[PDB]
Amino acid sequence: SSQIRQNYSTEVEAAVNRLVNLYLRASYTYLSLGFYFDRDDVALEGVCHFFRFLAFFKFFGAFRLLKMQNQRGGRALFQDLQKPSQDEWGTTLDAMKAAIVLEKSLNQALLDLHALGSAQADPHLCDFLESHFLDEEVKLIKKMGDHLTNIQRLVGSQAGLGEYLFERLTLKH
Amino acid sequence: SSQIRQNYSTEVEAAVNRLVNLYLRASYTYLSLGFYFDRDDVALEGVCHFFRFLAFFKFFGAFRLLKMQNQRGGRALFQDLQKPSQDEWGTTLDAMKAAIVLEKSLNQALLDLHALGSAQADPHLCDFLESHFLDEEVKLIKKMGDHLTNIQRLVGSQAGLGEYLFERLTLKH
Amino acid sequence: SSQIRQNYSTEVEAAVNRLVNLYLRASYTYLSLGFYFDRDDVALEGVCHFFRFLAFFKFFGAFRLLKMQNQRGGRALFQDLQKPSQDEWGTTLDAMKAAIVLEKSLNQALLDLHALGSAQADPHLCDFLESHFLDEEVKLIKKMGDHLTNIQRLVGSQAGLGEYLFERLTLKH
Amino acid sequence: SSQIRQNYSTEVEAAVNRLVNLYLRASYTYLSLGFYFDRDDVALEGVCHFFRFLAFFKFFGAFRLLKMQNQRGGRALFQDLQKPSQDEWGTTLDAMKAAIVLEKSLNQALLDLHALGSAQADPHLCDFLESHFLDEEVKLIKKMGDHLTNIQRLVGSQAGLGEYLFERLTLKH
Amino acid sequence: SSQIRQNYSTEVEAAVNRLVNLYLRASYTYLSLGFYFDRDDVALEGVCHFFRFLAFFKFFGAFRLLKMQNQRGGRALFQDLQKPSQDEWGTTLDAMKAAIVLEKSLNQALLDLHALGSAQADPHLCDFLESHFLDEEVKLIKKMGDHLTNIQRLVGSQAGLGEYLFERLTLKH
Amino acid sequence: SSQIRQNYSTEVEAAVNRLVNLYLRASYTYLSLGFYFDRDDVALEGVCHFFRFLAFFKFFGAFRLLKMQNQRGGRALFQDLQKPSQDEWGTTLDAMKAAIVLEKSLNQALLDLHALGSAQADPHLCDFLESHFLDEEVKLIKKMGDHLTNIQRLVGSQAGLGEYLFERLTLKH
Ligand SMILES: CCN(CC)c1ccc2nc3c4ccccc4c(=O)cc-3oc2c1
Ligand SMILES: CCN(CC)c1ccc2nc3c4ccccc4c(=O)cc-3oc2c1
Ligand SMILES: CCN(CC)c1ccc2nc3c4ccccc4c(=O)cc-3oc2c1
Ligand SMILES: [Cl-]
Ligand SMILES: [Cl-]
Ligand SMILES: [Cl-]
Ligand SMILES: [Cl-]
Ligand SMILES: [Cl-]
Ligand SMILES: [Cl-]
Structure with missing residues (x-):
């Protein structure tokens, strides 16, 4: 089979491939979010930049997963990307709500994979997730929650004003 | 006639002179826009600066056109400037709407001149417009559209507040 | 419809979206190529790096296309990525053959879109492709052809030796 | 009427607008002079540069006038530019003669406006002209007179030689 | 046939080879011009340097054409150089007249090749000429026209004096 | 005849012109060699660069000869370049064999011209060849012989491998 593979279950291998798919889909979702906010009839540069950055971060999560798959002697398998x-x-509110839903789903997939690794007595896998994914994800979700709260505070009765101010004074542009 | 002129139609020569007139008129329109926003009873420095910059950019478009007219062996002819x-x-909204109308007219004149050059098999003319004008114009129109959207989002029911905030937080001052 | 859109046909808009899909698929194909050559049982670092770089270049081609779609006032629409x-x-030979087939298909799609733009009298689109895509593509295809020739020269009767030497002495690692 | 305007007559306001028109026309005249000397069949770079510089200087005179109009609480009004x-x-001789005629007319308009300001007991207006226009104009007219004399000395019986030498050895290129 | 060639007609390939011949002949013509003005009984260093520089520029035009021929998958074919x-x-006047005749012929060959590329729907070829040749050629022809005018102005009745002065005060030495 | 010419025979003058022709032909031969090795179906960059460099060196040999022809008061005369x-x-072997044949012919032409100069008691000519040509030529021929030997050692029974290795490990790329 493989000359390096050791303590690396087929179940983990498949789950890692699934998780790569989920990260690449997330990157794709963020690419779409970013270009929507770049539209001339939307035109919220800070929001554009926030989601563009996340498209790149989620791609690099996928990349790290694929690197690890090879380091362990598993085989990357790619599927269609929805x-x-x-x-x-x-x-911006709708978009930030959709982003936190996405992130919570990615987090649950990380937790599920961690639990599989623990069940399989695969500490390298468990450490890998802990060290490179789980805290990054908690930090990101906390940032999105912070943003959601600020966006919600700004809606009030002048929604356009609040959306402009949030983009200008919170997000980087 | 001319010792350098080659593949440069009378139709293109005249159209280039017309286009110079249009750019100089646009520069003049932007000069007026800029000084209006500098009025003590208007007093929107960022808006002033935005249109002042455009007066200079449109003058330099005219200048480049006149340089090219001479490089090709045509003869600059100036008309009255309306x-x-x-x-x-x-x-600011009214002004930005008038600016995008102006820019769309300049863009259509560029496209018309490009089409004439193509019909006349004048690739130097076509390249010149493509390289120095057509993308600059698309970029400018996209920026104005972005601005229009942000200004429109800010009107709401507190129009003065929105006009101040746009000037302060979007435009450079 | 759109406040900026001018001289930008529905046919071009749709074709640009199709082309984005093709570039993103190409990026995905190169991602897979790169990780295959990173396998412990393949282990050709220079080949890995060559295809990894191309995954990033094709993503950035897609990104530029999407930026232009917005600059023109079209609407990005994403489809499933095969x-x-x-x-x-x-x-390495098989892989480089598959890469040149892919690149020739992308080139033909560029040429087709250029021809559509020319038919539609859309010089901005034509210039955009000429300036950012057509020469990059010719340069890339020429490099791949060079590589193919060198790989083919090295097969001889000691194929493993030739594959190692090409990776070590031509490709960057 | 105006919240800042003080000691600023309607007569001065109108005269300032007229003077802006005259400076912009002068700038336009110099633009035409500059491009004429850039013709391949004229080709006197130093002369081109001399008049090009004056087109920019006369524009900036207009700009300063418009800035002052606003500082005083008057209203810029633009007319058609002949x-x-x-x-x-x-x-070069013909052109330098036409330039000094133009400058003498601009100088007389400055003097007339100064006399109006003095009659109206408008010392700010009088100071403004003295400080930014009257000496600049005297210096320019003296330079043109110097040039005229040198050009006239060079005509002799070899007019082309003299025109070349003046351009090469007096004017900056 | 070729593993890279795509959308590159035999007609364009042959025309590019012809154009290489024309550029190399032009380089040869300029080499001869340069050494003639270096003769002890001619001795016009600025003129020598002007034509020497053009010999090198025309060689590099040929070189770029040959590079492109290979990038496209065509085959360089060289003929006798007249x-x-x-x-x-x-x-100097005779020489500058012969140079502008030469340049106009090279320009017409560029235009002809551009028209062939357009007819063949070869945008890479069209872009290549536009980007690297057509404007360089217009700029060169305009410079030569400028020079011709200055040389003609200097003939007058003291032709030797004018030829010396042009060499000393216009051309770089 | 000439105001500077002294001790410079018609026979030497003609022979120098012949030698210029031979150097320019050699430059042309090297230009062709260089672009052949740049072909996508040849693709030996080090070989390309080796011959490209020689095209430039042989041109500069011609240039030095023409400079000397003028320094001596002879008249450059150019012929058709085969x-x-x-x-x-x-x-690469075929090409390096053809290059050494070419160089030996150029060397024999140098030796013949030296012998003519010696017979004519023209020490300046003899010194010129000795100082700028004869040792450069011996050094070049020795380098080519070295290369030939290394290429021949590498043919063995795996000719493609040897051709690749020579290009990669001996020639500069
Ligand atoms: C599989 C197809 N998909 C998902 C849409 C890809 C493929 C490649 C990508 N490469 C980058 C990338 C590469 C280098 C530097 C920055 C970035 C970046 O910010 C975002 C990326 O996003 C990608 C998405
Ligand atoms: C009203 C139409 N007219 C008169 C023909 C204008 C308008 C704007 C101009 N802006 C400049 C300008 C702007 C920035 C930097 C340098 C220059 C310059 O050297 C000359 C100018 O000349 C102008 C004439
Ligand atoms: C007479 C027509 N032929 C022979 C094919 C020429 C003419 C001019 C040339 N000029 C150069 C040249 C000029 C400047 C810097 C580098 C180079 C060079 O590397 C090779 C050249 O090769 C030439 C050949
Ligand atoms: Cl499938
Ligand atoms: Cl009129
Ligand atoms: Cl779907
Ligand atoms: Cl009117
Ligand atoms: Cl032959
Ligand atoms: Cl002959």
Whole structure:
């Protein structure tokens, strides 16, 4: 089979491939989010930049997973990448809500894979997730929650004003 | 006639002179826009600076056209320059709407001249427009559209507040 | 419809979206190629790096296309991204042959889009492709052809030796 | 009326607008002079540069006038800008003669406006002209007179030689 | 046939080879011009340097054409290079007239090749000429026209004096 | 005749012109060699660079000869330049064999011209060849012989491998 593979279950190997798919889909979703906010009829540069950065971060999560798959002697297998769930993403609030839903799903997939690794007595896998993914994910979700709260505080009765101010004064542009 | 002129039609020569007129008129329109926003009873420095910069950019478009006319062996001919269409330019929104109308007209004149050059098998003319004008124009129109959207989002029911905030937080001052 | 869109046909808009799909698929194909050559049982670092670089270049081609779609006032629409055509890519020769087939297909799609733009009298589109895509593509295809020739010269009767030497002495590692 | 305007007559306000028109026309005349000397069949780079510089200086005179109009609480009003008096400008001598005629007319307009300001007991206006215009104008006219004398000395019986030498050895290129 | 060639007609391939011949002949003509002006009985260093520089520029035009021929998968084919049309080149005026005739012929060959590329729907070829040749050629022809005018102005009745002065005060030495 | 010419025979003058022709032909031969090795179906960059460098060196030999012809008061006369002897140059071995044949012919022409100068008691000519040509030529021929030997050692029974290795490990790329 493999000359390096050791303590690396078929179940973990397949789950890692699934997780790569999920990260690449997330990157794709963020690519779509970023270009939507770049539209001339949306035009929220800070929001564009926030999601563009996340497209790159999620790609690099996939890349790290694939590197690890090879380091362990598993075989990368790629599947079709589903398009994002929407073509238009509504307001900054709508978009940030969709982003936290996405991130919570990615987090649950990380937790599930960690639990599989623990069941399989695969400490390298468990350490890998802990060291490179689980805290990054908690930090990201906390940032999105912070943003959601600030966006919600700004809606009030002048929604356009609040959306502009959030983009200008919170997000980097 | 001319010792350098080669593959440069009378039709293109005249159209280039017309286009110089249009760019100089545009520069004049932007000069008027800039000084209107500098009025003590208007007083939107960022808006002033935005249109002042465009007066200079449109002059330099004219200048480049005239340089090219001479490089090709055509003869610059100047006409009367019509004053701008308004003496007072209303709100930032009104002004940005008038600017995008102006830019779309300049863009259509560029496209028309490109089509004439293509019909006349004048690739130097076509390349010149492509390289120095067509993308600059698309970029400018996209920026104005972005601005229009942000200004429109800010009107809401507190128009003065939105006009101040746009000037302060989007435009450079 | 759109406040900026001008001289930008629905046919071009759709074709640009199709081309984005093709570039993202190409990026995905190169991602798979790169990780295959990173396998412990393949282990050709220079080949890995060559295809990894191309995954990034093709993503950035897609990104530029999407930026232009927005600059013109079109609407990015994303579709499902087909997985790559193979899970395992054979020898360096096999892989470089598959890469040139891919690149020739991307080149033909560029040429087709250029021809559509010309038919539609869309010089901005034509210039955009000429300036950012057509020469990059010719340069890439020429490099791949050079590589193919060198790989073919090295097969002889000691194929493993030739594959090692090409990776070590031509490709960057 | 105006919240800042003080000691600023309607007569001065209108005269300042007229003077802006005259400076912009002068800039236009110099633009035409500059491009005439850039013709391949004229080809006197130093002369081109001399008049090009004056086109920019006269624009900036207009700009300063418009800035002052706003500082005083007057209202900029723009009129049609007459094309220059000639399409072709003859020899360097002809051109320098036309330039000094133009400058003397601008100087007389400055003097007239100064006299109006003095009659109206408008010392800010009087100081403004004295500080930014009257000496600049005297210096420019003296330079042109110097040039005229040197050009006239060079005509003799070898006019082409003299025109070349003046361009090469006096004017900056 | 070729593993890289795509959208590159036999007609364009042959025309590119012809154009290489024309550029190399032009380089040869300029080599002869340069050494004629270096003769002890001609001795016009600035003129020598002007034509020497053009010999190098025309060689590099040929070189770029040959590089492109290979990038496209065509085959460079070289023919005999005709000697220049004269052994002695007369006055600076005669020489500059012969140079502009040469350049106009090269320009017409560029335009002809561009038209062939357009007819063949070869945008890479069209872009290549536009980007590297057509404007360089217009700029060169305009410079030569400028020079011709200055040389003609200097003939007058003291031709030797004018030829010396042009060499000393216009051309770089 | 000439105001500087002294001790410079018609026989030497003509022979120098012949030698210029031979150097320019050699430059042309090397230009063809260089672009052949740049072909996508040849693709030996080090070989390309070796012959390209020689095209430039042989041009500069011609240039020095023409400079000397003028320094002595002779008259440069150019003839038609024959195309190179082949359109395709075979293997690196074939090409290096053709290069040493060419160089030996150029060397014999140098020796013949030296012998003519000696017979004519023209020490300046003799010194010129000795100082700028004869040792450069011996050094070049020795380098080519070294290369030939190394290429021959590498043929063995795996000719493609040897051709690759020579290009990669001996020639500069
Ligand atoms: C599989 C197809 N997909 C998902 C849409 C890819 C493929 C490659 C990508 N490569 C990058 C990338 C590469 C280098 C530097 C920065 C970035 C980046 O910010 C985002 C990326 O996103 C990608 C998505
Ligand atoms: C009103 C139409 N007209 C008169 C023909 C203008 C408008 C704008 C101009 N802007 C410049 C300018 C702007 C920035 C930097 C340098 C220059 C310059 O050297 C000359 C100018 O000349 C102008 C004439
Ligand atoms: C007479 C037509 N032929 C022979 C094919 C020429 C003419 C001019 C050339 N000029 C150069 C040259 C010029 C400047 C810097 C580098 C180079 C060079 O590497 C090779 C050259 O090769 C030439 C051949
Ligand atoms: Cl499938
Ligand atoms: Cl009129
Ligand atoms: Cl779907
Ligand atoms: Cl009117
Ligand atoms: Cl022949
Ligand atoms: Cl002949």
